[PDB]
Design a protein around this ligand. Structure first.
Ligand SMILES: O=C(CO)[C@@H](O)[C@H](O)[C@H](O)CO[C@H]1O[C@H](CO)[C@@H](O)[C@H](O)[C@H]1O
Ligand SMILES: [Ca+2]
Length: 556
């Protein structure tokens, strides 16, 4: 039997707002993405995940949707969306879209009606509760600052919002609401969408009665919001009434949920989701407040990957990513973005990303080795989540503004949202106007045009790796085995399928290191290396590794 197309596919995440502008408004659009499909094809990309593209007031840049069946005005029209589809299909490429159905915008017609009165037909499309003892219904905190409950004077009741105040949560306990969501999903699937990514999929179910969070739960409220009693009931239903009738791939963003519960989401026998986005790895060095950083080693890095691989079992599947629109740049976060180590480390992380077991996602710009942004003003940090950090930590005296910005500089979501660097023209060729966010000044050295013409560039190395994975089934669907989980210098693991075994070795130190193969293992061939002066001799039992050297080898 064969493996599904998505298990051996290489995905590329486009954040349309910051990818390519074509009308000089400073905002990326659909026409921009369409003009760059050849670039993505040439890289070797099989499928594209785009961030929300629906009508939105943009208080959270598309994650506050005011009309699920209309296209965001900034990105273009429905015609532009269809053309994007058609141009993708002509290149044998597939499209995955973002599905945001934990909540909607407060400008959605459902909510405008819902808030009108207690007897409105749409009232139960959301959660409305009376205050308690002169205060909020309960002690729920919002991800984006303050209470998760917001009072509305129109009726005197509070509505629930896990995130932004302009992002009220949808009530999945209401059957009529679920049917509306299902019909909306079919609407896009009938248009030929090949994949769906479910944003904060683990929070769909709310706990009956909304009791107060215990002191312990209050600490880790992200986890507590993923413990709704009817969650998997709703996910199985959505599969039965929607995805069972189509051949699209489903990807869940499982944020807040402990690893041991992930199988419930991705076990194919359960008929829920196909693969999972987990955040144990990408947040392995983030503190509980989601803005402080905690020092970690390669040991912690690889042991997390191990635990994540183990919950796949035989019937489940993982995605793999080192960066997205919500996190700092990969080379800055996991590598060394200093000008003498940036390219080398970026190539090293590319080797990891494309030799992991699971479906790899590459975030726009990482193939160029783009870096974190050098923030210098208040404005640079402008984001709804940072506004919330101010509300919860600065205005309350828990921390000074400078303390917040010092740490957020390393963790800000805006680090990943600076305009794609196409060339070295004005604003890196992203726009002919003023970009909605400032272009990283290092675009003079870091841009696509220069990378594409250089066989030693980061882009060329990614492109080479993508070709190798596509021609080596073991590197996609093969099994995973960490050689030494306790090693903090050199990351090494094997990929095996059908008698074929491959070895991956990556030095994470900016210093020369040595690696010794397991007893009875020898190098047969060298597929690729970065920062290496010479491939090992055939039959070698060990490797001499340069600083930040990475490689892939077929072994005996
Ligand atoms: O914003 C975050 C990342 O730093 C998290 O607090 C967030 O809870 C989580 O990453 C959820 O992700 C998705 O849901 C949000 C929708 O409200 C949106 O802000 C994120 O961009 C989207 O990725
Ligand atoms: Ca535009």
């Amino acid at each position: 039997p064969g493996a599904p197309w998505w298990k051996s596919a290489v995905f590329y995440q486009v954040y349309p707002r910051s990818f390519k502008d074509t009308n000089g408004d400073g905002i990326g659009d659909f026409k921009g993405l369409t003009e760059k499909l050849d670039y993505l094809k040439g890289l070797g990309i099989d499928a594209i995940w785009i961030n929300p593209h629906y009508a939105s007031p943009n208080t959270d840049n598309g994650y506050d949707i005011s009309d699920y069946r209309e296209v965001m005005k900034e990105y273009g029209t429905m015609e532009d969306f269809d053309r994007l589809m058609a141009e993708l299909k002509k290149r044998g490429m597939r499209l995955m879209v973002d599905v945001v159905i934990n909540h909607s915008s407060d400008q959605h017609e459902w909510f405008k009606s819902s808030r009108a009165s207690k007897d409105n037909p749409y009232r139960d499309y959301y959660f409305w509760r009376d205050g308690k003892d002169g205060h909020e219904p309960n002690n729920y905190p919002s991800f984006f600052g303050g209470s998760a409950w917001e009072k509305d004077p129109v009726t005197g009741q509070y509505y629930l919002h896990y995130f932004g105040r302009q992002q009220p949560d949808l009530n999945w306990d209401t059957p009529k609401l679920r049917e509306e969501l299902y019909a909306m999903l079919r609407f896009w699937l009938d248009k030929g969408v090949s994949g769906m990514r479910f944003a904060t999929v683990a929070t769909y179910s709310k706990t009956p009665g909304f009791p107060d969070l215990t002191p312990e739960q209050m600490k880790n409220f992200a986890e507590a919001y993923t413990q709704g009693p009817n969650l998997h009931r709703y996910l199985q239903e959505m599969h039965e009434k929607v995805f069972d009738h189509y051949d699209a791939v489903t990807a869940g963003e499982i944020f807040g949920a402990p690893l041991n519960q992930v199988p419930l989401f991705i076990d194919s026998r359960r008929k829920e989701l196909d693969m999972a986005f987990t955040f144990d790895l990408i947040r392995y060095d983030r503190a509980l407040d989601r803005w402080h950083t905690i020092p970690r080693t390669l040991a912690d890095f690889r042991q997390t990957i191990d635990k994540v691989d183990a919950i796949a079992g035989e019937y489940g599947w993982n995605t793999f990513f080192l960066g997205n629109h919500d996190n700092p740049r990969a080379v800055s976060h996991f590598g060394d973005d200093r000008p003498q180590w940036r390219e080398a480390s970026a190539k090293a992380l590319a080797t990891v990303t494309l030799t992991q077991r699971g479906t790899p996602f590459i975030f726009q710009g990482d193939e160029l080795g783009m870096t974190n942004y050098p923030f210098k003003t208040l404005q640079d940090f402008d984001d709804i989540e940072v506004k919330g950090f101010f509300q919860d930590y600065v205005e309350t005296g828990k921390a000074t503004a400078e303390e917040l910005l010092t740490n957020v500089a390393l963790t800000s979501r805006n680090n990943a949202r600076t305009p794609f660097q196409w060339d070295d023209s004005a604003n890196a060729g992203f726009t002919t106007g003023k970009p909605w966010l400032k272009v990283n000044p290092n675009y003079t050295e870091i841009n696509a045009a220069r990378e594409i013409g250089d066989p030693k560039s980061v882009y060329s190395f990614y492109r080479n790796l993508i070709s190798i994975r596509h021609e080596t089934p073991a590197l996609s669907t093969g099994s995973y085995r960490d050689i030494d989980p306790s090693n903090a210098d050199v990351y090494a693991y094997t990929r095996s399928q059908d008698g074929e075994t491959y070895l991956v070795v990556v030095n994470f130190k900016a210093e020369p290191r040595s690696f010794t193969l397991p007893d009875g293992m020898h190098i047969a061939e060298t597929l690729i290396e970065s920062s290496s002066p010479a491939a090992p001799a055939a039959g070698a039992a060990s490797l001499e590794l340069q600083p930040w050297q990475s490689g892939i080898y077929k072994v005996k």
